[PDB]
Amino acid sequence: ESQTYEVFEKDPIKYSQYQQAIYKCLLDRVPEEEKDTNVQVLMVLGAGRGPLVNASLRAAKQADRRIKLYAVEKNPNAVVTLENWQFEEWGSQVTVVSSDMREWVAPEKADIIVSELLGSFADNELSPECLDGAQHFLKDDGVSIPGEYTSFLAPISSSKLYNEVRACREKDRDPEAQFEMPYVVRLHNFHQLSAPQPCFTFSHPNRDPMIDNNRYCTLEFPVEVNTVLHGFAGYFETVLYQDITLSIRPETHSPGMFSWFPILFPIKQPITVREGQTICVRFWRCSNSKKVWYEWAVTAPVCSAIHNPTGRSYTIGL
Amino acid sequence: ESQTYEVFEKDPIKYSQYQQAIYKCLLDRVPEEEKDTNVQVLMVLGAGRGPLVNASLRAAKQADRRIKLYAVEKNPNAVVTLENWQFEEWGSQVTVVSSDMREWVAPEKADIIVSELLGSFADNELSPECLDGAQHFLKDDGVSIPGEYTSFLAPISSSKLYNEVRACREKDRDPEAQFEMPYVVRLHNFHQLSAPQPCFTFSHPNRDPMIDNNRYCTLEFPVEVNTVLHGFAGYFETVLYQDITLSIRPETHSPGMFSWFPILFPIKQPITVREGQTICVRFWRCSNSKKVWYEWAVTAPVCSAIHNPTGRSYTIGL
Amino acid sequence: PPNAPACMERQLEAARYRSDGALLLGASSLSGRCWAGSLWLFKDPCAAPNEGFCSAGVQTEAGVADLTWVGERGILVASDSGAVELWELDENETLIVSKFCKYEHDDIVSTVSVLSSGTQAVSGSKDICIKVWDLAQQVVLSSYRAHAAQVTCVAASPHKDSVFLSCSEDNRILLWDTRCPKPASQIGCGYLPTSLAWHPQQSEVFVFGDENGTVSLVDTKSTSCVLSSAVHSQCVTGLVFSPHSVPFLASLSEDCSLAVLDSSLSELFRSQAHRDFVRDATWSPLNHSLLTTVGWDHQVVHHVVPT
Amino acid sequence: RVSSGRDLNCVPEIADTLGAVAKQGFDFLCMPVFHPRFKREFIQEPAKNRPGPQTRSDLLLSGRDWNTLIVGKLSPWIRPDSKVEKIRRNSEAAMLQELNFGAYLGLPAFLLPLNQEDNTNLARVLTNHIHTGHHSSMFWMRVPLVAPEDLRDDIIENAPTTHTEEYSGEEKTWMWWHNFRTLCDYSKRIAVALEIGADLPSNHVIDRWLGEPIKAAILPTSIFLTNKKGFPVLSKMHQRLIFRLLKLEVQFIITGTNHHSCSYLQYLEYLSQNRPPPNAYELFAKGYEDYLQSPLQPLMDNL
Numbered sequence A, B: 001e002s003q004t005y006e007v008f009e010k011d012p013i014k015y016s017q018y019q020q021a022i023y024k025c026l027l028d029r030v031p032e033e034e035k036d037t038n039v040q041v042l043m044v045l046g047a048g049r050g051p052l053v054n055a056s057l058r059a060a061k062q063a064d065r066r067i068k069l070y071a072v073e074k075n076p077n078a079v080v081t082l083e084n085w086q087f088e089e090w091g092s093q094v095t096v097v098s099s100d101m102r103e104w105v106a107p108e109k110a111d112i113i114v115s116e117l118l119g120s121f122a123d124n125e126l127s128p129e130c131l132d133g134a135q136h137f138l139k140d141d142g143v144s145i146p147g148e149y150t151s152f153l154a155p156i157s158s159s160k161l162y163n164e165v166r167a168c169r170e171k172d173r174d175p176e177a178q179f180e181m182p183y184v185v186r187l188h189n190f191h192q193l194s195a196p197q198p199c200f201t202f203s204h205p206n207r208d209p210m211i212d213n214n215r216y217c218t219l220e221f222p223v224e225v226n227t228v229l230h231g232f233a234g235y236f237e238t239v240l241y242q243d244i245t246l247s248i249r250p251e252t253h254s255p256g257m258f259s260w261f262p263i264l265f266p267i268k269q270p271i272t273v274r275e276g277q278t279i280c281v282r283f284w285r286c287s288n289s290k291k292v293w294y295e296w297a298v299t300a301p302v303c304s305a306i307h308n309p310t311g312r313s314y315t316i317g318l
Numbered sequence C: 001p002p003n004a005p006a007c008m009e010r011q012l013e014a015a016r017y018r019s020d021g022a023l024l025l026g027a028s029s030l031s032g033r034c035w036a037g038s039l040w041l042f043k044d045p046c047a048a049p050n051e052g053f054c055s056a057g058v059q060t061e062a063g064v065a066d067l068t069w070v071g072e073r074g075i076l077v078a079s080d081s082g083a084v085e086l087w088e089l090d091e092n093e094t095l096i097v098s099k100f101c102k103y104e105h106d107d108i109v110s111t112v113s114v115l116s117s118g119t120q121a122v123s124g125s126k127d128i129c130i131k132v133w134d135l136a137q138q139v140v141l142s143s144y145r146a147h148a149a150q151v152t153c154v155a156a157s158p159h160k161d162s163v164f165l166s167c168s169e170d171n172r173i174l175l176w177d178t179r180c181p182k183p184a185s186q187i188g189c190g191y192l193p194t195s196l197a198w199h200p201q202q203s204e205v206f207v208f209g210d211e212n213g214t215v216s217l218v219d220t221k222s223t224s225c226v227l228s229s230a231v232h233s234q235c236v237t238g239l240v241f242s243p244h245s246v247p248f249l250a251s252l253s254e255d256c257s258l259a260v261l262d263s264s265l266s267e268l269f270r271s272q273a274h275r276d277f278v279r280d281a282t283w284s285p286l287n288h289s290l291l292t293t294v295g296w297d298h299q300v301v302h303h304v305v306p307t
Numbered sequence D: 001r002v003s004s005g006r007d008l009n010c011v012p013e014i015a016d017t018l019g020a021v022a023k024q025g026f027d028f029l030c031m032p033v034f035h036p037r038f039k040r041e042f043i044q045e046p047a048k049n050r051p052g053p054q055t056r057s058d059l060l061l062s063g064r065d066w067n068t069l070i071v072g073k074l075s076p077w078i079r080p081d082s083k084v085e086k087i088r089r090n091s092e093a094a095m096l097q098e099l100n101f102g103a104y105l106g107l108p109a110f111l112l113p114l115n116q117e118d119n120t121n122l123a124r125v126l127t128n129h130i131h132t133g134h135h136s137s138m139f140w141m142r143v144p145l146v147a148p149e150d151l152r153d154d155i156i157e158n159a160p161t162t163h164t165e166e167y168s169g170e171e172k173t174w175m176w177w178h179n180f181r182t183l184c185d186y187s188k189r190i191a192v193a194l195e196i197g198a199d200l201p202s203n204h205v206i207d208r209w210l211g212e213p214i215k216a217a218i219l220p221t222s223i224f225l226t227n228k229k230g231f232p233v234l235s236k237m238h239q240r241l242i243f244r245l246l247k248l249e250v251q252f253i254i255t256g257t258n259h260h261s262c263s264y265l266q267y268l269e270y271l272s273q274n275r276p277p278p279n280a281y282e283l284f285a286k287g288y289e290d291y292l293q294s295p296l297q298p299l300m301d302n303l
């Protein structure tokens, strides 16, 4: 919606971070002697109402280099805001493309593809798939911003959020489906039982054939206290360009960043954990031609049922 | 399943009909003087355990012409039966392809594409979509068998099948979903209130750009008796080649044919129809990139709700 | 084309050159209606696998999972039926006749190795047991359930008749010696051991290949400082040393390749001629730089190793 | 009188094999649906593109025979829980392939092994196949009373077999099963094929399988003692366990090669014939076993 994009726009830290990632890449790609010989093909993928397009222009001014911007967006309602901006302000500089980044046949290859297709659990908005289908129009030496991203997971206790999920039962569906789907939540009255550990990582471009975005990860979380496990908070980290990064992992949280809140992956039945015990969890990233989903299970101290088997409760559409 | 294919194989009438459709096409494509100069590229699309492949060979012997057979099947369990047959009996003649007919990059174009992708309501197994994606490998003058197919609809009364559908309520879903999905049924204790009328028709090849397989049809059915309408029986007719045809429309039913039984499209609330009244029904064929479905409504003598809006109760997967 | 079969099953399991230069072939049909096996002798190694250009052939009642020469006339076969088989060439070497078919294992006999003397042999099965056989007496001398899973490889000592190496899916590499009351010992040193090769000169050094494509050099003495190389991408199905006084190590794999390595495990040869899994390697007794590999693709590829 | 089945891992000709198995007196055959040794590749070229058929044809038997006499067996090289990523990916594709092939034939049951502590990914792939399509096939977990690692010959010089009682330790195979069904959400389609080894464990270990869905018992030929006349028999301890299983009405499965001059089956029939007669209660309840009924309310309702 228009207001969802307005909310994402009002996050200075994230855009001042994207600005710098483009700035440092512009310097690394075009030397001061080549300042006017080479104009860099910049392609914003999933442009929305164009906050990255503006950041790309702000990065081109401070890096004092020439850029050729393209603003690819599939949401045609957003595309109206872009085309009004292109006419009233941007001009010939920005070529607005109203397409799906995996269907667009581009005129020439890109020097830099810049995208914000990341959710609270990094690859949970299908950024791996989107940029894979866009990878064919990136120069055999082009830069993707972000270059890498990693999802993190930490075991939690909150009898208050476990109840909040129980209350999510709806009619005409599985009476237990509310426990087999992630939720975005600003976790507050809860307890983190072990330090966050990395779960899934994706790097762009992915030059490897049989690339495969499916995953299976086993995590072992040491617990020092006696407790009751109800779920797993998920966070993410991303490498925009070199040292420029964004994070929602609490121990490396980018100060003042608003666009993301933690995810929560609940479990049907709460699990007793004694002091000194290890909580072992298994996560999977699954997919078919049409849908991507997560499946997960606790294997220690005791087993749980496999949650969301075959995306039966929750899938993310392709 | 293996037994589903065994059941479809034990239908002589349908295969003796397909035999003749190939026979008459072989004669029309290769003149007696060209008998050995030209070998015809025959491509079975959706071959199963190969009953059409055998029919194509029987048609080549009686037409006394040369053929180059290909047996395209996506079901790899069926593909095992095909590859065992190819080794033990068919030989070099038949090139078994274990692919989806819309993904297969063919060596050369086909002279004739032969397929059985038809259900009880003709286009309800997605034959339009399948042969559209296969149309690029048909010669700019090739023949598709079947060349055409048409779905038929007739209003019915059966308080016995209306109850049978009511009994189909399942837990964890819409309490009324059983009324928003077709069923294959050998209709018996029922009453046909008006003669079958054509609904949707598809022809192959479809040389027209912006081809569009979506449909919207309005039917007006004259009723001579007082009654209670519960649903709509659906049947089909198909033109294999020229005068060779198959039908499940009761007034033109191909004698002794077993492979198809009528479909039934129910309505939530039964409708009173007085003698002389007209039952008006509206049918739609809908689709997105991933699913195809039907939506439908009665508009006379009284309106019903639109059944299956957005495939919410039943869609057919692409 | 003698009094034997007219077709040889697509899956070529084993290639073994005897002293003169004649080639032994083991084959099984791992698909199709029949799942049986065959034994072939090619006095002309260049004529293989052509069924009409062979010296002798025979039909086994079940697939050939492994084989070894029992001298110059006999052939020892690891069968899927659970049988250990001994087939001996006739007086003219135009027939291959069954001597013994002993059903003593409770699952597929996966590996076979003839002991230094040649009067005894060791079989390793999926039934987890290892058995010591008396080829002449036609019996099992000892039955050993020392493993906790399927036995992948059994390799008799080059020179000691009481010593052999076994490896298994239970992650163990067992050094055996029938002269002890507890005959087996675990070689210390990760990934599951898949192939075993005794060094032909140092009767205390051997190599092992693992399911992760890595090949490793091991000395029984100080079982530390192990030398290893990532030779293959997929599992290592076999390791065979060249007849040279300073041998070359040939390694076959599921990645469909062959590589010939030196004493420091570095790569000197690489062959992608194979389109399916490489199942065996046999260096020519006559031309030591000429090595043969048979695959699952029915190829019998002859390689000239750049020495 | 006993529902018995032959377990094989070698079937060169399916019709000959079945004919001999039935001649022997078995009611069903457990056999591989693909060649146990035919390892397949699903990710890398050129073994990915291996041509020719992948197994024998479904046409080789009537649908009625696939439906009633053949029990499928998962291929022993399929390891969804391997520590090697490529082997898990390849094993996932191969397990779904093998399971979907048995569903295509309408086999009444398919066998899968539980022989390690970690079977997480195997369970996820089974759960996934259960939620895929329309099949209704029974899944049998081949789980041993005693793990192969705890019945091994004490012949490893530097790794000896402990003689100390590990109470919970000796019942490790039950936790392999318990974890697998907790992962698979207690599916009614997942049952136990309990494998009985050479020497029986502690009674407590056997009592862990009480109340569990045992659909079959696997008796290897190697656990049979020889009598004075030379035919196979079982120890009084082993016999006692058979009598428990007969009340549970399990399907007896004979695995392994022959070791005596069928007699293995005939002994079970003899034991089944010698069992005590059913008393008045046992005869009246014959059919009502573990069948949940509503408690009568003769005050509220009229009987």
Ligand SMILES: Cc1ncnc2c1ccn2[C@@H]1C[C@H](Oc2cc(C(F)F)c(F)c3c2CNCC3)[C@@H](O)[C@H]1O
Residues within 6 Å of the ligand: A005, A008, A009, A045, A046, A047, A048, A049, A050, A051, A072, A073, A074, A075, A078, A099, A100, A101, A102, A116, A117, A118, A119, A125, A130, A259
């Ligand atoms: C296949 C394909 N082809 C073309 N575009 C595609 C896709 C798939 C998605 N999208 C676009 C991406 C874009 O996502 C955002 C835009 C803004 C900005 F506009 F504010 C954001 F802040 C944030 C996001 C999403 N993560 C949180 C922050 C949204 O507009 C989608 O329509």
Ligand SMILES: Cc1ncnc2c1ccn2[C@@H]1C[C@H](Oc2cc(C(F)F)c(F)c3c2CNCC3)[C@@H](O)[C@H]1O
Residues within 6 Å of the ligand: B005, B008, B009, B045, B046, B047, B048, B049, B050, B051, B072, B073, B074, B075, B078, B099, B100, B101, B102, B116, B117, B118, B119, B125, B130, B259
């Ligand atoms: C995109 C794509 N690519 C390749 N093949 C594809 C598809 C989609 C479907 N299919 C095949 C078609 C085939 O359908 C039949 C086969 C036989 C014969 F085998 F008996 C039949 F009698 C009948 C049917 C279906 N209508 C009733 C009669 C089935 O095997 C599917 O897997």
